[PDB]
Amino acid sequence: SMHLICQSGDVLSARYEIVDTLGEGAFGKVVECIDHKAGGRHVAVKIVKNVDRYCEAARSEIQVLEHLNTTDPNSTFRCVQMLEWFEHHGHICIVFELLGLSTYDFIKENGFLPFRLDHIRKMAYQICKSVNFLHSNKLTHTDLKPENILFVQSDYTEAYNPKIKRDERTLINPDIKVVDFGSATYDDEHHSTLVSTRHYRAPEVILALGWSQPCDVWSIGCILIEYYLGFTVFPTHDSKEHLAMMERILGPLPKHMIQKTRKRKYFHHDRLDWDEHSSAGRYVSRACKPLKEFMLSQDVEHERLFDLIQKMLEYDPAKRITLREALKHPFFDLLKK
Numbered sequence: 533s534m535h536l537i538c539q540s541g542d543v544l545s546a547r548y549e550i551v552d553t554l555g556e557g558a559f560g561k562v563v564e565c566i567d568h569k570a571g572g573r574h575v576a577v578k579i580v581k582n583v584d585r586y587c588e589a590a591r592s593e594i595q596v597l598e599h600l601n602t603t604d605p606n607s608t609f610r611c612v613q614m615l616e617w618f619e620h621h622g623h624i625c626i627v628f629e630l631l632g633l634s635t636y637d638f639i640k641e642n643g644f645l646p647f648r649l650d651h652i653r654k655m656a657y658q659i660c661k662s663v664n665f666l667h668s669n670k671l672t673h674t675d676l677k678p679e680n681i682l683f684v685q686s687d688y689t690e691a692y693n694p695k696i697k698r699d700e701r702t703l704i705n706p707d708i709k710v711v712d713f714g715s716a717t718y719d720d721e722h723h724s725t726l727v728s729t730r731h732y733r734a735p736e737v738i739l740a741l742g743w744s745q746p747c748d749v750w751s752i753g754c755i756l757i758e759y760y761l762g763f764t765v766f767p768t769h770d771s772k773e774h775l776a777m778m779e780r781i782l783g784p785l786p787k788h789m790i791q792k793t794r795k796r797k798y799f800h801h802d803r804l805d806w807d808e809h810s811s812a813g814r815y816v817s818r819a820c821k822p823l824k825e826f827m828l829s830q831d832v833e834h835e836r837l838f839d840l841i842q843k844m845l846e847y848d849p850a851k852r853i854t855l856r857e858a859l860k861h862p863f864f865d866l867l868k869k
């Protein structure tokens with residue numbers, strides 16, 4: 533019955549009038565509303581499916597946000613502000629401040645073109661700062677991806693560009709906020725075996741080795757690559773293929789992780805069980821290639837970004853760079869006076 537309560541013109545809680553849908557998901561949807569009790573200002577309302585797994589996640593999200601918005605009332609660390617929550621026809625609804633497009637939707641609407649490097653540098657710094665704040669408060673997000681990173685303002689200028697014979701959108705302000713804390717997990721809570729959206733999922737997660745803050749760093753690495761290229765480098769829906777893609781881009785998995793995993797089905801004699809001359813094998817070869825071959829320039833600033841990404845995509849989570857270290861990386865030197 534969600535379709536029946538989330539339409540343009542419906543009024544929620546005698547207050548919020550739905551204008552349009554901002555996004556949809558397995559969880560339910562996010563709608564833009566007019567808040568008639570706050571003078572007509574626009575807000576985002578997340579309407580959660582009335583299904584146990586999503587109700588529990590929504591309840592968990594509300595606890596996490598109460599904590600974060602109380603610790604950082606000014607959003608210095610750029611987590612979205614929750615304004616309130618309520619029930620509407622048995623559905624949990626969470627009201628948030630209204631932001632601009634997700635970084636994913638902006639890329640999508642721009643024909644899957646990447647962001648400019650100077651924007652990426654600022655967005656990356658802000659993502660690392662925001663998530664590091666979570667890591668400093670004993671939390672792991674677990675579901676970082678471009679859909680969950682939103683521009684504060686997604687306005688852009690638009691010009692014909694000769695170089696690419698097409699109209700192109702240039703983002704005006706690249707400031708972001710991090711959203712979606714429904715999967716966020718405290719150090720002392722139960723760690724679900726499966727986390728992250730596949731394309732952003734860390735190798736310790738796929739291998740069911742246990743996970744913790746470093747899995748977020750992996751996700752951020754995947755995000756930065758997508759921002760740079762305009763597409764994901766792990767476009768797959770299959771775990772084994774995904775691991776094969778990693779292997780082509782980053783080299784072989786560490787032995788000790790292969791030996792430790794309970795997912796035997798991927799391996800044979802401690803090597804990935806993957807015929808590189810199969811149909812899917814030839815695809816993985818011709819489409820994927822070593823990480824640095826994706827660089828669009830040899831200019832040092834590009835090299836600095838790729839050095840950071842490479843450190844974020846370290847297989848062994850115990851060795852993977854932390855966000856505290858990442859914030860001091862040379863890629864960010866240009867942001868400092």
Ligand SMILES: O=C(O)c1ccc2cc1OCCOCCNc1ccn3ncc-2c3n1
Pocket residue numbers: 554555556562576578612628629630631632633634679680682711712713
């Ligand atoms: O899960 C939350 O905590 C969440 C909170 C707020 C918003 C979205 C959220 O969900 C995931 C993102 O979905 C992208 C859809 N597009 C837009 C566009 C503009 N806004 N402004 C706030 C949100 C929003 N979503």
